[PDB]
């Protein structure tokens, strides 16, 4: 019979708490929590807006609660980490050759940010100038 | 003693080996081929080559051109009919490789581009960036995978070859992990185990280039041709002996002239003490250093705290290529029916007294193919053998091994190893003297002796490397002695082999235009004989 006895180290559900690289990862894929909470509020407002005029004032006064304010400030910082990481990984799904060379993510990346920038000004422009 | 059956067996999975396996496969589709290697095939030394492989390709070139560049370089000690054969087949192998996916660097045209390497008048060096070795081996290895006939024995260290009545019948090897003895039956074995560059205290070869095979043939009355020739490479880093390529100089990059100059500077006080043995490339610049030497820069920054673009790399010549090997006929076959040696471990009579840059790899794919080919033939022509003799033989192995294990004495094998390398660096160096040469033979025999008082303190079975390095050392000594003796005897100066003593400082085509054969007898003494070189169209002068 064989004299081999392979020692298999177990992998724990906390494997990611070790190395910081894993930690930065969890925040990214963990950036989803807030991303929903906001999408939930949206729905509350969509419905709240339609429900009633007086139900609206209550709505705003709601988000007017110190707690709800903070949570969103958070949800926003999260919405940027996400936007930040997402823009860095995206380029990698593409294989583009420019004159015998596979161009990097620096050309795609920098240009995604631009669009993003252009958007905000618009959304903000249309949103507050009329 | 578990028994495995196969048609033909091959020890070693480098470029030459795998090429040998694949053709056998292509040669006989119903074949059961056993491929063995003490390391998974991708870690074979071939993976280290950076220059490129040669093959006539440009329109203004010719075979007679290649041919001439080869004999010329081998200082006329080349078996000219073998060179012919070799040359006309490089192109065909080099195309099969591309055809198998090998990313040969290309032309803007879409065709395969060639470079100038090894100081050949006309370039014919095919290349894949400066990772040619890597790419050839992997393409080879990966190509092989598609063949069911090829049965692999990864990390199986070969102890010995079964031979009876002048004919090979198989081999013993150790399942490295399980630690057992496997006994393989075949009517032809091909042997490509790679060079003996690890023998020197200073080399470029991987830790597996111990030249076991070479030693494995010696025990069986086979000679090792032109072992006195060692090709030293110009740039070698301390301890690691990590190479610094040649193409650097064609481009303003900054020979027994400098070699010699620093070497005899050691006796008058004219050498400039450094930590190891200045390569200044500062002026080089990014584009050329990272396109041709991305490897050269990372091993320098790594092992010496020196960035090839910011500081000079401390170096001194180290051993690189072992030309001599098992004596072989034009079909890569040895004096033992069914026993072929292909690759660097052999001596097809291709390189003579000095291998031409980029011809090694070519050889691999070129003779590798033939090596497998002729094996398959002699394979179905072998006929049966006296089973009792074969089986009685395998026992001599399991026994000799036991005897080896039980051996005691307190000698640290690792210390011996050092001393031997240390002796080689001094007596079989760029410049050999009857004086220093003698000293090394003596040292060498002395160690052979001590090898008998070595104790292997490790008795475990799962992947026991303490035991293997020892067995490897075993072969190291043996071969190392042919080199020495061979060298001492060649009282002349040829290609690789340069002496400084009166009446030997120059090439003598009158008395030494012959081959060197070292035989190791049961008595333990190395005997030398001499053979003659086959001339065809290019006589010496």
């Amino acid at each position: 019979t064989t004299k081999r006895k392979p020692y298999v180290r177990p992998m724990t559900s906390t494997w990611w708490k070790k190395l910081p690289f894993y930690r930065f990862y969890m925040l990214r894929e963990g950036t989803a929590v807030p991303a929903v909470w906001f999408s939930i509020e949206l729905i509350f407002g969509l419905f709240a807006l339609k429900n009633g005029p007086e139900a609206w004032a209550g709505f705003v006064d709601f988000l007017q609660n110190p707690v709800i304010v903070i949570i969103n400030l958070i949800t926003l910082a999260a919405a940027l980490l996400h936007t930040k990481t997402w823009f860095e990984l995206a380029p990698k799904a593409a294989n583009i050759i420019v004159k015998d060379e596979k161009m990097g993510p620096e050309p795609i990346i920098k240009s995604l940010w631009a669009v993003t920038v252009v958007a905000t000004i618009v959304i903000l422009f249309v949103a507050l100038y009329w | 003693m578990q028994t495995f059956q196969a048609d033909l067996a091959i020890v070693g999975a480098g470029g030459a080996g795998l090429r040998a396996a694949i053709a056998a496969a292509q040669a006989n589709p119903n074949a059961k081929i056993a491929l063995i290697s003490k390391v998974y095939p991708m870690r074979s030394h071939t993976v280290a080559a950076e220059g490129g492989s040669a093959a006539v390709a440009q329109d203004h070139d010719s075979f007679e051109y290649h041919f001439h560049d080869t004999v010329a370089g081998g200082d006329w000690l080349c078996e000219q009919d073998v060179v012919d054969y070799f040359v006309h087949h490089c192109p065909t192998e080099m195309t099969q490789l591309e055809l198998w996916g090998c990313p040969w660097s290309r032309r803007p045209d879409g065709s395969v581009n060639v470079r100038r390497f090894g100081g050949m008048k006309i370039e014919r060096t095919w290349f894949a960036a400066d990772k040619t070795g890597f790419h050839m081996l992997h393409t080879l290895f990966q190509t092989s995978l598609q063949f069911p006939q090829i049965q692999r024995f990864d990390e199986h260290f070969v102890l010995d070859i079964l031979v009876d009545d002048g004919h090979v019948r198989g081999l013993v090897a150790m399942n490295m992990m399980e630690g057992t003895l496997v006994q393989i039956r075949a009517n032809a074995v091909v042997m490509a185990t790679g060079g003996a560059g690890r023998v020197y205290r200073y080399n470029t070869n991987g830790g597996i280039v111990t030249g076991d095979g070479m030693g494995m043939a010696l025990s069986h009355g086979v000679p090792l041709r032109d072992m006195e020739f060692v090709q030293y490479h110009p740039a070698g880093l301390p301890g690691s002996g990590i190479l610094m390529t040649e193409g650097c100089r064609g481009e303003g990059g900054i020979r027994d002239k400098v070699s010699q100059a620093f070497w005899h500077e050691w006796r008058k006080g004219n050498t400039i003490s450094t930590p190891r043995g200045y390569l200044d490339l500062r002026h080089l610049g990014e584009k050329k250093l990272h396109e041709r030497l991305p490897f050269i820069c990372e091993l320098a920054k790594a092992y010496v705290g020196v960035d090839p673009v910011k500081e000079p790399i401390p170096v001194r010549p180290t051993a690189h290529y072992t030309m001599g090997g098992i004596e072989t006929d034009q079909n890569c076959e040895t004096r033992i029916k069914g026993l072929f040696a292909v690759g660097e471990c052999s001596s097809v009579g291709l390189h003579g007294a000095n291998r031409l840059g980029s011809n090694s790899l070519a050889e691999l794919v070129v003779f590798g193919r033939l090596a497998g080919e002729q094996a398959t033939e002699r394979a179905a022509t072998a006929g049966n053998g006296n089973e009792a003799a074969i089986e009685a033989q395998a026992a001599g192995v399991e026994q000799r091994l036991k005897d080896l294990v039980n051996q005691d004495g307190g000698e640290n094998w690792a210390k011996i190893r050092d001393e031997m390398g240390l002796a080689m660096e001094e007596g079989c160096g760029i410049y050999r003297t009857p004086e220093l040469m003698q000293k090394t033979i003596d040292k060498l025999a002395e160690l052979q002796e001590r090898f008998k008082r070595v104790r292997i303190t490790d008795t475990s079975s799962v992947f026991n490397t303490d035991l293997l390095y020892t067995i490897e050392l075993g072969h190291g000594l043996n071969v190392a002695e042919c080199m020495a003796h061979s060298a001492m005897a060649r009282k002349e100066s040829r290609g690789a082999h340069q002496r400084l003593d009166e009446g030997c400082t120059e090439r003598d085509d009158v008395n030494f235009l012959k081959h060197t054969l070292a035989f190791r007898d049961a008595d333990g003494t190395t005997r030398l004989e001499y053979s003659d070189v086959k001339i065809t169209t290019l006589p010496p002068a």
Binding site: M26, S39, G45, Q64, N72, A119, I123, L124, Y129 | -
Partner: protein, 119 residues
């Protein structure tokens, strides 16, 4: 060893949505959080830009309903998706999490639709 004829996965579908969701919430989410989550509640805006009257006026416009929908829905599928793999990552057992997570998503899709399809 390794299955010679593996089970073709359906992941591409969810990765498809997830992919688009993540790209939209990357570009548009920030500003949305911005106006709605901070500017509006603190009244930091000109006259009646973010007041019920004009808001509704936008909400009922075609480009408005469409936008709201994606704005809400889209992120959902990108987010809820991750949250689902969050389990595995954390070696967390969730009974039919596939359904729970995805299901939840399919639910608010329709709900959100209802929200905007009505007015």
């Amino acid at each position: 060893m390794i299955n010679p004829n593996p089970k073709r996965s359906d992941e591409p579908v969810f990765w498809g949505l997830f992919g688009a969701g993540g790209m939209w919430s990357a570009i548009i989410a920030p500003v949305m959080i911005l106006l709605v989550g901070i500017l509006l509640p603190l009244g930091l805006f000109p006259g009646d830009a973010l007041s019920y009257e004009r808001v509704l006026a936008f909400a009922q416009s075609f480009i408005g309903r469409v936008f709201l929908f994606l704005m809400i829905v889209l992120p959902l599928w990108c987010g809820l998706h991750r949250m689902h793999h969050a389990m595995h990552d954390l070696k967390i057992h969730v009974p039919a999490g596939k359904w729970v997570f995805y299901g939840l998503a399919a639910i608010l899709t329709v709900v959100t639709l209802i929200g905007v399809v009505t007015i």
